[PDB]
Write a protein that binds this ligand. Structure first.
Ligand code: NAG
Ligand code: NAG
Ligand code: NAG
Ligand code: NAG
Ligand code: NAG
Ligand code: NAG
Ligand code: NAG
Ligand code: NAG
Ligand code: NAG
Ligand code: NAG
Ligand code: NAG
Ligand code: NAG
Ligand code: NAG
Lengths: 230, 290, 215
């Protein structure tokens, strides 16, 4: 089976450069052109260029030609994309993809669609440095009650970079949980909330604790959420 | 340019890949032809035979031992400043007009066990390939058949005597790879080689017509980009150009996904464009003036 | 340069229903080099169609691509749960690589009003000198919702952000949070903090509010 395996997520300062690798298996690496394509938050996919491992020939998008370098190591079955002079707008998921097979009946490049994609690699460009989150309770009450059921949660504020994970009661509570995608604040730091709806009748007998983990900062926090002493 | 012995020198065409030091722009592999065209194209290009000359302070050692895998020691050595010209300058699958092997069909690789390395075959009996403007190349079926039988025999000898040897068509994302792509002067032939590589040898019953006709598309070089290495083509509406060569060897790569422990699958073509160059450069080595 | 425009932005269908994706090109695509891709969150995009009409390997025969020149179509005879995803058209080859903005194939269900909850800033956060107010819209359909903050009846602007979950795989609903962020100072000088929601399932905007430092 044809597969492209890409290197792990990357966090970079503006002005720096990033090198993303793309390793092939299940086919003869040198025999197929490789495309590089990105998609930034809320944007369309953007083609950056291609490289041909067989002859070293390359092609560039005019938007990236000055800042991008494509390279290949056939002995390692790996293609590389390096992007320099990074800027915040370069924050995106970067994908490699192999062209399809060429056949006699095709015109040259009829096969230059994106036949097999890698899962992508996240590149974050930001001046922010690693920052662990503050974790604040979102207390239940009559203001987060819907008759028989109530809402409660945890606000995970001001962390960098992604990701954090959130569980509840150490995994004992999974139903009704909504952990929201992070939001990038103007400060450049991330925030998310995790909430869970529970029976209002258990707000006095049941303890609720959100477990927040942020590996990049080695931060682990367990915060007890409690009806605001009222 | 003279040659004498009584001095042994170690060679390794792998560690010392000398096409790795032949990376000049495409615009210098071609010169503008002044051939009085006296229908005609305004400017025409001729290929200059590929060769390497030793820069000042360096000399090229040439191993004169005919049967030589390219690596190990070499007794019969000589000193030259340039390697022998390689023609044609491009050749994707078959190797034409090369040097024939002495008495034996010879195959070589940097590492046979590593399927990533190209297998270069050198024949001892040349097979003619006549191509015309009508868009086809012709090869005698009987001669090609015997050729494959001899090649499969050597491959077995390398990979085990009870291996079935299967030839399959190229797999790739460009015609330069998939077809047998070669130039006869300024005319480039893209030939569908499926018919040449579609047989299995020594399975359980192995101990068409008269001639094999390969369909071919023909393009004529009319310009090129220098910093990009991109060639520019046009149909040869000039007329009918003939071309007859000798198949003297070929490039193969062996499949790495084969689930059959009793077979090996080989496809035409190398893992690199300059492999045709490498087939002719195994007996050279660049050194410093002693 | 070639601009591709897809419609509709969102396609809401139930399993068993026919789906039709449109891709319109600013340029006539003479090469017929049009492809369609399927993309699911956290997964590699997948080729569905190439050469306008060629089904890619492994792709169900429920998929088909057609069209010519300026207008191209991807159709699914009968939608299946695994078809829910984003779909992109693209042109490729000859230095012309460009993608449509995508169409979301989401699952249709009956309209569902959100349950709205508001959360005061914790007094532990207040100590750090900041105040975040959270508003929650829980389990609603369709995704379209408007959330506005008002502090002492004044419409707030440029001090809140919101976030929406992916469509729930069980009830096919969405949930949304909106976070209003103020300084401790700006927070003190006001008392009424209201979250105002409007949705298709509500016959009127709905307000959830609290009085500052009081319950
Ligand atoms: C031409 O090559 C194609 C695949 O590249 C193959 O399927 C076909 O059989 C070949 N045709 C001839 C006449 O050899
Ligand atoms: C060594 O090279 C010479 C070059 O003239 C060649 O003729 C000869 O075959 C080689 N040595 C012998 C005696 O085989
Ligand atoms: C190639 O040369 C090496 C170095 O002497 C030798 O060990 C090896 O057997 C040769 N390969 C063959 C079988 O031609
Ligand atoms: C091909 O071989 C034949 C006879 O073996 C010969 O007449 C012809 O000149 C050869 N072509 C070359 C040297 O490329
Ligand atoms: C040429 O080499 C092949 C295989 O190595 C061998 O079978 C044949 O006898 C050799 N001699 C000829 C026919 O030139
Ligand atoms: C040949 O390739 C095999 C498998 O890839 C490897 O184990 C071996 O080390 C290689 N031989 C070399 C490089 O000496
Ligand atoms: C190729 O042309 C040569 C003349 O140089 C001729 O002897 C031979 O019969 C031709 N080969 C084929 C297979 O047509
Ligand atoms: C090719 O050789 C094989 C094995 O010797 C044989 O089965 C077949 O008839 C040959 N085809 C010809 C003579 O063209
Ligand atoms: C079977 O394969 C072996 C390799 O282990 C080979 O030596 C032998 O010639 C083959 N057949 C026979 C005659 O046993
Ligand atoms: C091979 O040599 C012959 C005769 O020297 C020549 O006509 C032909 O152009 C050569 N083949 C190629 C591919 O250049
Ligand atoms: C491939 O070879 C087989 C014979 O084993 C033949 O039946 C088939 O038609 C061939 N296809 C070609 C030559 O394109
Ligand atoms: C060799 O013959 C066997 C049957 O004995 C057959 O299954 C196989 O396909 C043939 N060739 C190959 C591809 O190994
Ligand atoms: C299959 O190949 C493996 C090598 O990984 C070998 O160990 C095994 O004996 C082979 N199976 C048989 C019995 O043919």
């Amino acid at each position: 089976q044809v597969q492209l395996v890409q290197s792990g997520a990357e966090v970079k300062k503006p002005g720096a450069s990033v090198k993303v690798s793309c390793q092939a298996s299940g086919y003869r690496f040198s025999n197929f052109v490789i495309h590089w394509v990105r998609q930034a938050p809320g944007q369309r996919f953007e083609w950056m260029g291609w490289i041909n491992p067989y002859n070293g020939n390359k092609e560039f998008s005019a938007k990236f030609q000055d800042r991008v370098t494509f390279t290949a190591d056939t002995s390692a079955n790996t293609a590389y994309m390096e992007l320099r002079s990074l800027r915040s707008a370069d924050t995106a998921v970067y994908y490699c993809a192999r062209v399809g097979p060429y056949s006699w009946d095709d015109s040259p490049q009829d096969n230059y669609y994106m036949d097999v994609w890698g899962k992508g690699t996240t590149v974050i460009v930001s001046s922010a440095s690693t920052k662990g989150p503050s974790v604040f309770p979102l207390a239940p009450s009559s203001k987060s009650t819907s008759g028989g059921t109530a809402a409660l949660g945890c606000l995970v504020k001001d962390y960098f970079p992604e990701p954090v994970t959130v569980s509840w009661n150490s995994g004992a509570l999974t139903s009704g949980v909504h952990t929201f995608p992070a939001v990038l604040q103007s400060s450049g730091l991330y925030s998310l909330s995790s909430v869970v709806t529970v029976p209002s009748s258990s707000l006095g007998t049941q303890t609720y604790i959100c477990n927040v983990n942020h590996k990049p900062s080695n931060t682990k926090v367990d915060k007890k959420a409690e009806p605001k002493s009222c | 340019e003279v040659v004498l012995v009584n001095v042994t020198e170690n060679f390794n065409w792998c560690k010392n890949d000398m096409v790795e030091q032949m990376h000049e722009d495409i615009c210098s592999l071609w010169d503008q032809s002044l051939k009085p065209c006296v229908a005609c194209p305004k400017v025409s290009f001729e290929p200059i035979p590929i060769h390497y000359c030793a820069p000042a302070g360096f000399a090229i050692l040439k191993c004169n031992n005919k049967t030589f895998n390219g690596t190990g020691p070499c007794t019969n050595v000589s000193t030259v400043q340039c390697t022998h010209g390689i023609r044609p300058v491009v050749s994707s699958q078959l190797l034409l007009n090369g040097s024939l092997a002495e008495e034996e069909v010879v195959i070589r690789s940097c590492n046979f066990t590593d399927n990533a390395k190209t297998i270069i075959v050198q024949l001892n009996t040349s097979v003619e390939i006549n191509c015309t403007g009508a868009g086809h190349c012709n090869i005698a079926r009987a001669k090609w058949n015997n050729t494959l039988k001899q090649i499969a025999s050597k491959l077995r000898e390398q990979f085990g005597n009870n291996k079935t040897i299967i030839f399959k068509q190229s797999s790739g994302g460009d015609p330069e790879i998939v077809t047998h792509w070669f130039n006869c002067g300024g005319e480039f032939f893209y030939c569908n080689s499926t018919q040449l590589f579609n047989s299995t040898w020594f399975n359980s019953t192995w101990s068409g017509s008269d001639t094999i006709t390969l369909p071919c598309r023909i393009k004529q070089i009319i310009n090129m980009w220098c910093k990009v290495g991109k060639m520019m083509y046009a149909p040869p509406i000039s007329g009918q150009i003939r071309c007859s060569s000798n198949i003297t060897g070929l490039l193969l790569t062996r499949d790495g996904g084969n689930s059959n422990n009793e077979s090996e699958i080989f496809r035409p073509g190398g893992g690199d464009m300059r492999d045709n160059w490498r087939s002719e450069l195994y007996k050279y080595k660049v050194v410093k003036i002693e | 340069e070639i601009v591709l425009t897809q419609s509709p932005g969102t396609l809401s269908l139930s399993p068993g229903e026919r789906a039709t994706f449109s891709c319109r090109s600013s340029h006539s695509i003479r090469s017929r080099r049009v492809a369609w891709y399927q993309h699911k969150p956290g997964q590699a995009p997948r080729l569905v169609i190439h050469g306008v009409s060629n089904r890619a390997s492994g792709i169900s025969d429920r998929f088909s691509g057609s069209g010519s020149g300026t207008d191209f179509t991807l159709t699914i005879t009968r939608v299946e749960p695994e078809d829910f995803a984003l779909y992109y058209c693209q042109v490729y080859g000859a230095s012309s690589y460009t993608f449509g903005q995508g169409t979301k194939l989401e699952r249709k269900r009956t309209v569902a009003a959100p349950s709205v909850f508001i959360f005061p800033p914790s007094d532990e956060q207040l100590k750090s000198g900041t105040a975040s107010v959270v508003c929650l819209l829980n389990n609603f359909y369709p995704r379209e919702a408007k959330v506005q903050w008002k502090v002492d009846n004044a419409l707030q602007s440029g001090n809140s952000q919101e976030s929406v979950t992916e469509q729930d795989s069980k009830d096919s609903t969405y949930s949304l949070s909106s976070t209003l962020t103020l300084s401790k100072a700006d927070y003190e000088k006001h008392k009424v903090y209201a979250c105002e929601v409007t949705h298709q399932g509500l016959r009127s905007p709905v307000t959830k509010s609290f009085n500052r430092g009081e319950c």
